[PDB]
Amino acid sequence: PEYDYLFKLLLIGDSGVGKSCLLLRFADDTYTESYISTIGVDFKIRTIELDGKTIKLQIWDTAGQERFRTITSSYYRGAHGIIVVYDVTDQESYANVKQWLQEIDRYASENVNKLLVGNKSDLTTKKVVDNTTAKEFADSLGIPFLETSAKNATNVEQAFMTMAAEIKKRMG
Amino acid sequence: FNAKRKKKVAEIHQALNSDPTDVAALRRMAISEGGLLTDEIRRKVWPKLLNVNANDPPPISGKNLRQMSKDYQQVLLDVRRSLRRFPPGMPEEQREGLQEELIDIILLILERNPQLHYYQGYHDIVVTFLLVVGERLATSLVEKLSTHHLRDFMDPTMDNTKHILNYLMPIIDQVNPELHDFMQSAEVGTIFALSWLITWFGHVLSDFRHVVRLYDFFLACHPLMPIYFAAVIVLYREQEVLDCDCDMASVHHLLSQIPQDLPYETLISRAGDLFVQFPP
Ligand SMILES: Nc1nc2c(ncn2[C@@H]2O[C@H](COP(=O)(O)OP(=O)(O)O)[C@@H](O)[C@H]2O)c(=O)[nH]1
Numbered sequence: 001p002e003y004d005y006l007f008k009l010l011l012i013g014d015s016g017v018g019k020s021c022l023l024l025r026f027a028d029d030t031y032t033e034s035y036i037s038t039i040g041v042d043f044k045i046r047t048i049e050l051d052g053k054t055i056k057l058q059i060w061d062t063a064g065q066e067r068f069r070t071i072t073s074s075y076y077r078g079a080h081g082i083i084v085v086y087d088v089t090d091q092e093s094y095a096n097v098k099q100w101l102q103e104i105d106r107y108a109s110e111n112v113n114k115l116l117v118g119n120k121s122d123l124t125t126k127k128v129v130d131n132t133t134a135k136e137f138a139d140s141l142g143i144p145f146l147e148t149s150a151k152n153a154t155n156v157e158q159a160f161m162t163m164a165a166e167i168k169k170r171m172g
Numbered sequence: 173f174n175a176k177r178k179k180k181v182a183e184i185h186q187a188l189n190s191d192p193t194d195v196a197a198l199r200r201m202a203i204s205e206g207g208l209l210t211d212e213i214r215r216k217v218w219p220k221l222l223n224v225n226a227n228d229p230p231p232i233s234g235k236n237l238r239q240m241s242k243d244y245q246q247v248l249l250d251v252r253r254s255l256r257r258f259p260p261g262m263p264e265e266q267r268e269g270l271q272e273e274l275i276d277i278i279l280l281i282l283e284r285n286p287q288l289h290y291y292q293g294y295h296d297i298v299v300t301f302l303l304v305v306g307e308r309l310a311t312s313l314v315e316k317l318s319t320h321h322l323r324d325f326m327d328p329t330m331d332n333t334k335h336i337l338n339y340l341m342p343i344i345d346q347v348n349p350e351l352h353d354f355m356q357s358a359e360v361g362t363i364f365a366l367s368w369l370i371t372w373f374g375h376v377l378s379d380f381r382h383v384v385r386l387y388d389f390f391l392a393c394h395p396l397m398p399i400y401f402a403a404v405i406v407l408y409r410e411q412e413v414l415d416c417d418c419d420m421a422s423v424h425h426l427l428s429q430i431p432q433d434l435p436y437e438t439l440i441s442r443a444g445d446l447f448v449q450f451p452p
């Protein structure tokens with residue numbers, strides 16, 4: 001055997017918030033200034049270490065634009081954990097989180113693990129969504145919240161680890 | 173190749189000069205090995221191929237194009253991340269100018285045609301035209317395209333596009349029934365060709381010279397051609413799709429990770445013959 005558990009992750013979220021960039025930070029440990037508009041769907045692979053046991057995480061990337069929802073909707077059921085990403089510098093992205101959870105309620109598993117990420121925490125001059133205001137929303141819902149920068153190494157690593165633990169504990 | 177190419181330029185020029193433009197022979201030249209060769213030939217030919225008049229005056233771009241357009245933010249977003257489609261050589265100042273141009277073409281077409289809906293990926297098409305035809309020509313040609321070949325990709329919903337994508341499988345079944353049965357076992361679906369179909373393989377193929385030569389081929393043929401081209405690729409990749417785990421993740425990622433060295437000219441000829449053999 002190679003891995004002890006395989007968990008299926010899905011990066012849901014608005015468009016241009018940082019999903020693609022995040023996945024590249026965690027799975028490849030790079031960051032590229034433009035990268036590429038994510039069209040359709042695909043995944044990157046990364047196996048980690050947690051509480052003795054070894055975990056193969058396969059993490060799926062999505063297209064943000066609304067029209068693309070009915071295409072990626074199919075890829076929710078098979079997900080152990082779904083990560084809702086918004087950009088802290090963009091007010092609509094945070095305002096849309098509410099709609100994204102509505103998608104998770106609609107398409108994802110009955111008991112799926114959730115996590116809410118505010119990305120681009122490195123842009124302090126342009127920060128719009130409030131640190132304590134996002135935390136409070138998450139807390140009311142019973143979801144882990146983290147603020148992450150994919151540009152700086154910052155906090156990208158811990159986000160996925162926090163998600164992997166939550167799935168594991170639930171899984172048995 | 174040289175003398176054979178020299179002939180083609182003379183053939184293509186003879187067809188443009190013909191008493192009425194020999195569009196038939198231009199399509200035929202576009203499908204044949206090498207496409208339309210220089211982008212300069214294309215500036216002449218492509219307009220003939222789309223029936224847009226090359227010598228028309230430019231469309232009027234009104235005062236506050238970006239300001240009032242509902243699609244400014246999204247388009248801007250995609251154009252920013254279009255960087256890799258530009259030649260490595262061209263300097264930032266020039267590239268940014270073209271990018272600023274690219275945003276304006278898209279937003280205008282979207283304005284001139286209210287029924288058309290922007291989608292992520294449209295920008296890969298427009299930028300291809302922008303770098304061949306040029307801003308003035310690209311804007312008129314893509315409009316024609318947007319209302320015919322890409323007409324379904326710009327419907328409010330993804331419905332017609334999904335339907336087009338579904339073709340891929342009945343086509344594979346006609347040529348390699350066993351492969352079709354393997355892929356269905358895996359439940360790969362057809363969303364691996366989304367990028368391919370919607371951007372005319374422009375989002376996915378790295379080498380620009382190969383992208384325009386594909387555009388040559390797509391302009392001359394039927395609107396649904398790109399999917400028959402997708403089918404031909406999967407079929408060409410038979411022994412890797414089968415020699416591979418029969419679960420979605422494995423097959424989806426494999427097809428998704430498209431080879432950079434396809435036998436374009438061989439695949440095109442297969443696409444053609446497959447289109448005529450199993451027509452839509
Ligand atoms: N400063 C900063 N910019 C980011 C960060 N993540 C993404 N970006 C920007 O957003 C663009 C790409 O966003 P992307 O990840 O493709 O968005 P998504 O694919 O819709 O999630 C990049 O060109 C960067 O300019 C980040 O963590 N910090």
Ligand code: BEF
Pocket residue numbers: 014015016017019020037038039062063064065
């Ligand atoms: F542009 Be992101 F991938 F929604």
Ligand SMILES: [Mg+2]
Pocket residue numbers: 018019020021037038061062063064
């Ligand atoms: Mg993305």
